[PDB]
């Protein structure tokens, strides 16, 4: 089990597949090379804070099956995975500091049954054999599975998962998992939650008739359809570009609509996967800009159900919503019975 | 009360340095600044400058985030340094000027623009900032931009566009066209009348006049016939000649924009910096026509038409100076038999 | 008279090394070359090679700026080194060969290709440069390209496309189709008749034969009946099977281009280099079907059908060898009941 | 109120981190911390650790500057971490332990030793610091040193020497011999009686008993005759055999010290860390006798004499455990014909 | 079965690569190799070569741990590569040769010295390793060393000293004086009769002949009269002239050793490598006399006097050639009036 053996697997199998054999490796700067037909060819560039040869081995041993997005694992408090590596493609780095029975340099244990693992929240995969029963034995852990497990009440997860860095709703493969959580040896009854859609501006696809209507109808016609007058969707979702300080624009679907009409620039000054993102946005057409614009990608149907169930009387209040298995705080301003603004917080 | 962990706190919370109090844990590895979020390192900044990583990180965090003049304009007006701000050169991914004033203990030659070391340096003043207006009139060398009029100073209207967080744009919700005032050796100078480059690119090129709309839509012959351009080698200078191994002409960006919709090509920017004239190693994919140094300037097509129609065709070779972006750009004017052979700008 | 500051002078003024005289100030930090332009540092080159930064910089500046054979062609033909030039591998962003001849004092193993150390090595000769044709006569091992006839040597027509500054193109204002010649231990070897890959990509894919046009517009079932491909597993090999967790087939680039036209997918090039056969880690965004190693070749679909129709369908597993890009590409052929199960190349 | 510019201020003014307020300008390049003095950069710290430069810089500045136990003693007592201080490992030029407590936001697993994450870790407590005494008696796993006696706890007297700013010394103006108390799983443990290594080196080796004075001055035969060491292979184990190509014995530092005054030799420390037993690749200059792995322990010669005289000569080969520096060191005892063949410690 | 973690396992347990099985965790940061020892990182190797860090680490671990010829000897004898071993250049802290044979898959040009690529290269053969003697018979070009007779080949006695793990020594428990043999294109060449340098240093200089003893104790004037060196400029060439701003003479190491015995001086080795003649930038601390290039050779003073007495004193300037360490060392000889002005070697 060597660096030369890990590079052999990457070359011949695209990742670490347990096949033995070795190829020559040159390590220069943060880059792993190998000679192919007399010349050097880059196999990996380290963009982690780990040693180059260690990050390289973790990347080769990344889980290449559909796995939960990193933000779901973080919201559930996961500290470490059991016998695999979750590659965080947002940061091009391992999702967790340590490993369990993966790499001799990062292993704090070889099996999740060891003492150092008991206080940590360990992620278990029900597709790996025996890991289901290991989750019950674990004191603090989180489990996914593709089918019901006897003795546990599932909590249905998102439709999307991550497959080699591609977030997708699987058709040829299952990507919706049942979730289970234990804390201090006590099983948790996970709260019913809204899920974020994990979409982007370029390839945005609507996922309900209301989202289709939002992309097709005019602003005042859509607000008339779903009777959102006084809920300030014009500000919150569509965004106001009239002043130098950009207003609202907190729903990704609204960002996608604007981007389709006119380009803008988004600075992700904290590049990582989280339920709420904060962007520094500069609108190229108008020049309207905002240093911190919080954006969340809820299904528009879910966002409507959330804002329609609020108290329009209090001028300022903080509201918590269970999204992606965590409590997201929203700042709700009001004035004379109508919504001023409504945005999430990271 | 200035430090590395404080700069990173402002970056994480306010998107940039806002003067807030606070600290976050930072680890410096290679040329990259990281910070910890839920137990894992997240990259905040990758140093692409020739300055030390923690220094450039701080200067980037303190960049001006209002609409500011493009670096090429400040270079052409002789600016050596800015007053109490950092103009981030997004073309080079590095600060625009070597030193700073009242910004960073590492790079500060002075803490206020009134110090003696600044007198021989042309200092940039932003009239939108309070007191910066008064600091210009008692500065020896300087350049001032403002929005309104300055009492007793005649304004030179600058370009329509400015740069905002690296995005060049003609502002609508914010003003990006400034008045320009320059002072040399303590005495106010009369800025010459000047053309301005349009500061566009190929991917999102849009015409800004009727003639430019006709250029993109009409055929080469039809355009030359309508605007009476016979004898000015527009087929060569603007449209470009792709018939030979050496590519001919193609010195106007709109010529590249028109060709780009028909066929892709490669533009190597071997001197990646902001300037009024850009040199490119161009390789056209359709024909294989290429040229090592192909100088390109983005002028409004009507402006280029006016410039070349005012020239004299009698001399076989000639160098013509034209004030563009407040600087004297040289043009070579090859002529033969009373018609323009070519007309290319020099970098 | 070779100087680092002189190489940088040529890059700034001529876009590449053109033998001009002069120098400019140069900084070297990390694996990056900078130069001072009007007071500030400007990046000229970022070293991605395993060579010293100043050395790699000099080889990049002295790269061949004429249409040259693609690196996959030179590799298949056994080329070990070029004569008095640098073939830049833009797929690797590095020199294509380990050593040089009469190019750079730090990598040169000889100043002329006639020296003793070069005799056991296959030297690439460019017939367009004067004297290189006769150098090919005096060399034991070598590969010569010309755009014309050489007296007494049978020509082998090469691919229509060459590489010009990293752009793979079929030339119209310059010629990219060369006559190839080869020598081994002094004897002029007859090159084999070969197919050539088309060297296209997904984003800019354009059909090149009437059959390839019919592949893109017409439905899957209509195309197979129109060209009598029944039993040849075109449903699997060219179109792809995304119903299963493991992706099936999809070994023709034109098949990926048709899928990419309607639905995005992921292509990890875990061995980034130029070759006739590429291996990709493919992940389909719509279905989630994925394959760790998917061998893909861009043959003209007409060439692919005549290759697959000619093989016999009796044996359950047969390793067919076909000559593509002057090399023995091995194909794995699975058969059952007189029809094709799958047919894929190997790297 | 913690930052990089503040750490550097304390380093420049107080020689180390003293908790003073202030800031100095810092630039980070490579693995080195610099600061400006009269316009030029001066190196404050060169990161030799595997931690980020600014992190190790801060941990170094916060190193304990009082006499502290040598790292090898803490390793042998099972210490995983220290409480509210940094034990700098001057042998490795890096922190002795992975994590910290109440020291540095980057490396802190906790801010006080009473947090839950510390319970399974053996924490080091310095009784010379106020309250650290009370923090030991309510800690699950821990190791405590103090100067006086602890009421109701029986003390285990430790070595005479401690380390002070990287200098191992037997203190005269300051006390360096400590009482040692260890607690495992909440219950106090009885530390075994133990020998202690002398922690000397060759350059400044001084004898610490009469027998060691006789060893350095007397001839090999005269010493063995006076202290009645026939049969214990002192010629081999201690004096060393340089007659063969493979060097024999030489497992006692005083043997190397005596040989060093007669003739120089090379000691390659291929595992450069502090430990009770050191392995060296030794090459003797006079004879050319060498050995790849030569284990060396610096025991008081009287202690080694006592150890080997208590053994049983009847068994041909035997592994003997000896408590040195609070750990069980294994020895191989080869015997033949009733006399010791050799006796070497194992690392 | 070559593994990076396996090479590190051998370094930790065997002090070098000894073919043992096993692995240890390894970190690679900067040009440094670390390993985890009981929770913390320990440095095992710091790369000073121009080779990749993991590659240089593997060559260092596989270095020859037997007495080998000094690098200056192997260089003078034209050695280009070693057979199935690594000669480590401790003067450069790098491999002595560019490539390897059957040592490391990343630097190997062949697995056996008999392959075609090695025929034009001079391969170093160690007669102590079984089979290497006959490999020297089958090789076109090579250099063989033995500590015994080989049937049918005239031996050439080599220097008394060899290198053992960077220590240059005359062996007593092992033999460092070898018989040398050489082949060129298949024929066994007769090696020339030669002097050998003594390879001593200033700090550990010890005389090796009665004349050299008399050089150290006796005064300058007594020594010259005792050995009839009048008119041979021993006052200048060996003792040195420090009265002038430009230092004079001092080309014999024994002369520097005598000066260093009484007064320190500075020796800048601006070309740090092993060679028969060294060039130093010398600065005397007492007088301030200095020389930019001072060529120094450590010949036995007896060998130097018989070289200088034999040359004729008629010609004003003559370039004498003398065979030292199997190479043609060129000496510059200045004469006047039948006496020596100066006499110095060149590099
Ligand atoms: O009296 C106030 C003060 C603030 N706000 C809201 O708070 C802002 C966000 O916070 P901030 O910019 O730090 O002040 C704006 O929300 P939005 O434009 O992002 O939707 C919006 O003005 C009010 O609605 N009434
Ligand atoms: O009789 C000549 C000779 C040269 N030129 C012009 O001078 C060249 C500048 O480039 P160069 O050849 O390196 O000197 C070409 O400029 P372009 O417009 O094609 O870009 C153009 O041919 C002429 O117009 N008539
Ligand atoms: O009895 C066999 C064994 C293998 N194959 C083929 O070989 C596979 C590729 O290799 P593998 O997946 O490692 O087995 C598949 O081809 P394809 O989907 O890549 O086009 C296809 O199953 C057969 O057709 N019959
Ligand atoms: O019949 C034997 C065989 C071995 N030994 C001992 O075991 C060796 C340990 O090293 P090694 O040879 O690698 O196993 C030597 O230890 P030392 O005291 O010289 O250092 C020593 O010779 C004997 O004493 N009698
Ligand atoms: O007519 C000459 C010219 C040169 N030399 C010798 O050559 C010098 C070395 O070279 P340089 O100083 O560059 O001239 C001195 O020798 P030394 O002091 O190094 O031993 C010495 O002057 C003469 O003796 N007669």
Curated annotation (Swiss-Prot), chain A:
The record marks 294 as: Uracil recognition site. Uracil binds at residues 290-294, 341-345. The active site is at residues 235, 250, 290. Residues 2-62 form the Nsp15 N-terminal oligomerization domain. It is found in: Host cytoplasm, Host perinuclear region. Likely affects Nsp15 binding to RNA. The record marks 290 as: Transition state stabilizer. Changing residue 235 to A: Complete loss of NSP15 endonuclease activity. It catalyses: uridylyl-uridylyl-ribonucleotide-RNA = a 3'-end uridylyl-2',3'-cyclophospho-uridine-RNA + a 5'-end dephospho-ribonucleoside-RNA. Its cofactor is Mn(2+). Residues 63-188 form the AV-Nsp11N/CoV-Nsp15M domain. Residues 205-344 form the NendoU domain. Homohexamer. Plays a role in viral transcription/replication and prevents the simultaneous activation of host cell dsRNA sensors, such as MDA5/IFIH1, OAS, and PKR. Acts by degrading the 5'-polyuridines generated during replication of the poly(A) region of viral genomic and subgenomic RNAs. Catalyzes a two-step reaction in which a 2'3'-cyclic phosphate (2'3'-cP) is first generated by 2'-O transesterification, which is then hydrolyzed to a 3'-phosphate (3'-P). If not degraded, poly(U) RNA would hybridize with poly(A) RNA tails and activate host dsRNA sensors. This is Uridylate-specific endoribonuclease nsp15. It comes from Severe acute respiratory syndrome coronavirus 2 (2019-nCoV). The chain holds residues 6453 to 6797 of 7096 of the full protein.
């Amino acid at each position: 089990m060597s660096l030369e053996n890990v590079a052999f697997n990457v070359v011949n199998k695209g990742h670490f597949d347990g096949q033995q054999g070795e190829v020559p490796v040159s390590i220069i700067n943060n880059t792993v090379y190998t000679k192919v037909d007399g010349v050097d060819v880059e196999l990996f560039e380290n963009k982690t804070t780990l040693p180059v040869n260690v990050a390289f081995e973790l990347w080769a041993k990344r889980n290449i099956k559909p796995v939960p997005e990193v933000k779901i694992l973080n919201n559930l408090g996961v500290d470490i995975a059991a016998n695999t590596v979750i590659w965080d493609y947002k940061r091009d780095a391992p999702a967790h500091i340590s490993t369990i029975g993966v790499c001799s340099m990062t292993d704090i244990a070889k099996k999740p049954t060891e003492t150092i693992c008991a206080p940590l929240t360990v992620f278990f995969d029900g597709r790996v054999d025996g890991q289901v029963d290991l989750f019950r034995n674990a004191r603090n852990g989180v489990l996914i599975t593709e089918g019901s497990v006897k003795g546990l009440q599932p909590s249905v997860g998102p439709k999307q998962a991550s497959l080699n860095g591609v977030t997708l709703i699987g058709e040829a493969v299952k990507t919706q998992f049942n979730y289970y959580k234990k804390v201090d040896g006590v099983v948790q009854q996970l709260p019913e939650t809204y899920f974020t859609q994990s979409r982007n501006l370029q390839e945005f696809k609507p996922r309900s008739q209301m989202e289709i209507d939002f992309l097709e109808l005019a602003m005042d016609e859509f607000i008339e359809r779903y009777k959102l007058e006084g809920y300030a969707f014009e500000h919150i979702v569509y965004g106001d570009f009239s002043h130098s300080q950009l207003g609202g624009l907190h729903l990704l679907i609204g960002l996608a609509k604007r981007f389709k009409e006119s380009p803008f620039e988004l600075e992700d000054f904290i590049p990582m996967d989280s339920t709420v993102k904060n962007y520094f946005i500069t609108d190229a057409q108008t020049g309207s800009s905002k240093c911190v614009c919080s954006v969340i990608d809820l299904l528009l149907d879910d966002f409507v159900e959330i804002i329609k169930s609020q108290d329009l009387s209090v001028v300022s209040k903080v509201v918590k919503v269970t999204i992606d298995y965590t409590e997201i705080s929203f700042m709700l301003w009001c004035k004379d019975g109508h919504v001023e603004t409504f945005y999430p917080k990271l």
